[PDB]
């Protein structure tokens, strides 16, 4: 028969949309449009050669510990090259434990799993990571918004809404952040401001994830402190992944924080899988302890530099007066902002119409309260292209602004 499965599905299941985003990602799909609207790394950045040499030394020297099931956990070399590499490299303390997941998407379900209880308070930054949204969202949590700026997340505004909050006798659990090259944003939190978090949370004792997946795509500046590096009480944990610094295709990505509450994730991640692809822990694990991560780094970076510097000279050229954007030193977006009234939702049909996509910024708030942005990738597509690109989402805009 087949009927009607919808007598079936649970009520947090039968509120389940599709993810709009995607619906026009798969639209531009296969299409001669200038896309700017993805948020995937360019092949060409993949270490193709460096895996190949991996691939066959795991097949002769760890064929086994690759194949076979293994801890939970994860990979314990994985676990202890990362930690090693962390510290050595952004003054982690390795008094935090560490544990391998699948990337940010399901660190944050676990996340949301071992905290969030229905109607828990959950500060996010306005815009935010999409997939954080998607991930919380079935934990029915608060959303409290704190907007961005050139610099990050305003938090002063932060303690305004925190004491606000402490006078209806209800708090925050979790406050979650991307304070690198934010996607959407492409803005970095300042250091004065990650310090400032840091005594928020202690004075109103709450946790705070730092989800850092496109730290190492700096393209200029100088590199920023973690927000966990400036963790003393272990408040923090951070989010890391393989995915833009080695290949999507492995699914690779850890969680850092204080032991009790690795913890606790850990019996959760047993419940939702028993572990993460094995085969692809060696390979991450043989990337870093083998020095090719060190090498192959400069290397994205010269090839995303570029990139980033030709959308930035096009849209100072092509953009009419009004348009606003953000100067991202790393990472793969850069956020536009149109004058009022402008609806960057409606107008990509438009767009569309001449030859150029994007995504509408209105998906990456959490209550949907600005209409006037959108973000731009500027790695999937070449250098050439996004010259032209930017140029015909200028005139996209232009003609908008009269009839």
Not at 153 to 158: F, R
Not at 238 to 264: E, H, N, Q
Request: proline share 5%.
């Amino acid at each position: 028969m087949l009927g009607d499965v919808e007598r079936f599905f649970s009520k947090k299941a039968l509120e389940m949309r599709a993810s709009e985003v995607r619906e026009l990602l798969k639209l531009v799909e296969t299409s001669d449009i200038i896309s700017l609207a993805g948020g995937l790394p360019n092949p060409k950045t993949f270490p193709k050669e460096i895996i190949r040499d991996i691939l066959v030394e795991i097949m002769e020297k760890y064929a086994d510990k690759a194949l076979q099931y293994g801890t939970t956990k994860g990979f314990t070399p994985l676990r202890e090259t990362l930690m090693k590499w962390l510290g050595k490299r952004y003054g982690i303390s390795q008094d935090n434990d560490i544990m391998i997941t699948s990337g940010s998407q399901q660190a944050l379900d676990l996340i949301g799993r071992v905290f969030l209880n229905p109607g828990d308070i959950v500060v996010v930054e306005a815009p935010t990571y999409l997939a954080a949204l998607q991930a919380f969202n079935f934990y029915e949590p608060q959303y409290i918004q704190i907007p961005l700026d050139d610099e990050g997340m305003k938090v002063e505004i932060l303690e305004e809404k925190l004491k606000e909050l402490k006078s209806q006798g209800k708090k925050v659990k979790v406050v979650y952040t991307v304070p690198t090259f934010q996607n959407p944003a492409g803005v970095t939190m300042n250091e004065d401001r990650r310090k400032y978090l840091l005594e928020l949370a202690s004075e109103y004792d709450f946790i705070v994830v730092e989800d850092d997946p496109y730290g190492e795509l700096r393209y200029s500046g100088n590199p920023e402190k973690k927000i966990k590096a400036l963790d003393n009480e272990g408040r923090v944990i951070y989010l890391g992944t393989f995915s833009k610094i080695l290949a999507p295709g492995f699914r690779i990505g850890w969680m850092v924080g204080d032991p009790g509450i690795i913890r606790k994730m850990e019996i959760a991640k047993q419940s939702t899988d028993l572990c993460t692809n094995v085969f692809g822990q060696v390979v991450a694990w043989r990337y870093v302890d083998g020095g090719y991560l060190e090498k192959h780094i400069p290397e994205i970076r010269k090839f995303y530099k570029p990139r980033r510097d030709a959308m930035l000279e096009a849209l100072e050229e092509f953009m009419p007066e009004g348009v606003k954007w953000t100067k991202p030193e790393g990472g793969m977006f850069i956020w536009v902002t149109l004058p009022d009234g402008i609806d960057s939702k409606k107008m990509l049909e438009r767009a569309i119409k001449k030859g150029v996509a994007y995504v509408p910024g209105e998906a990456f708030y959490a209550h949907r309260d600005v209409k006037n942005t959108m973000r731009l990738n500027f790695t999937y597509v070449d250098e050439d292209k996004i010259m032209e690109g930017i140029k015909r989402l200028a005139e996209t805009i232009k003609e908008e602004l009269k009839a």
